[PDB]
Write a protein that binds this ligand. Structure first.
Ligand code: HEM
Length: 153
């Protein structure tokens, strides 16, 4: 559970993300793929990408990042009351894409990295802590939904 103050820090920095969703999405995916190359294997439509420049130039990857961040943003804005938004995500990621919880941990780390790289003045220790809690809640709830569907994290 996050306090109201923690949710406000989360949404304050999220507003910065919303000023350039595509750009943030690209940086997050690139960071994810560079730090954890095994994750790229899960994307049949992106695994052909060989260099950082190719990744940045991919319209398809850029569009996907907007889809990803739009979904995450919709979840965060519910401040924990996110069952309706989270359920379909768990369904697809468990039963179609087969994304282990550890990979959600990897992308969470990428999100923190990119947000701190771009907005240090609005993403200090307390804001990082809040976002970490929000992403931990997201992962915890999706893991529970995974199990409900018969998929082990
Ligand atoms: C913040 C965490 C994530 C969010 C909010 C998210 C969101 C989404 C959304 C909204 C879609 C499109 C609809 C759907 O199929 O559910 C999608 C598709 C997909 N996601 Fe995720 N995702 C996340 C993390 C991951 C991770 C870490 C991976 C891989 C390691 C992954 C792999 C995929 C794949 C392979 C697709 C299908 C892409 C395509 O071929 O069109 N997702 N994701």
């Amino acid at each position: 559970v996050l306090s109201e103050g923690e949710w406000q820090l989360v949404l304050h920095v999220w507003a910065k993300v919303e000023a350039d969703v595509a750009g943030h999405g690209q940086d997050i995916h690139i960071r994810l793929f560079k730090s954890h190359p095994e994750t790229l294997e899960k994307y049949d439509r992106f695994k052909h990408l060989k260099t950082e420049a190719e990744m940045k130039a991919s319209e398809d990857l850029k569009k996907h990042g907007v889809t990803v961040l739009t979904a995450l943003g919709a979840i965060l804005k519910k401040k924990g009351h996110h069952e309706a938004e989270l359920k379909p995500l768990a369904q697809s990621h468990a039963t179609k894409h087969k994304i282990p919880i550890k990979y959600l941990e990897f992308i969470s780390e990428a999100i923190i990295h990119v947000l701190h790289s771009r907005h240090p003045g609005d993403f200090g220790a307390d804001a990082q802590g809040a976002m970490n809690k929000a992403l931990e809640l997201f992962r915890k709830d999706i893991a529970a939904k995974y199990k409900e569907l018969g998929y082990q994290g």
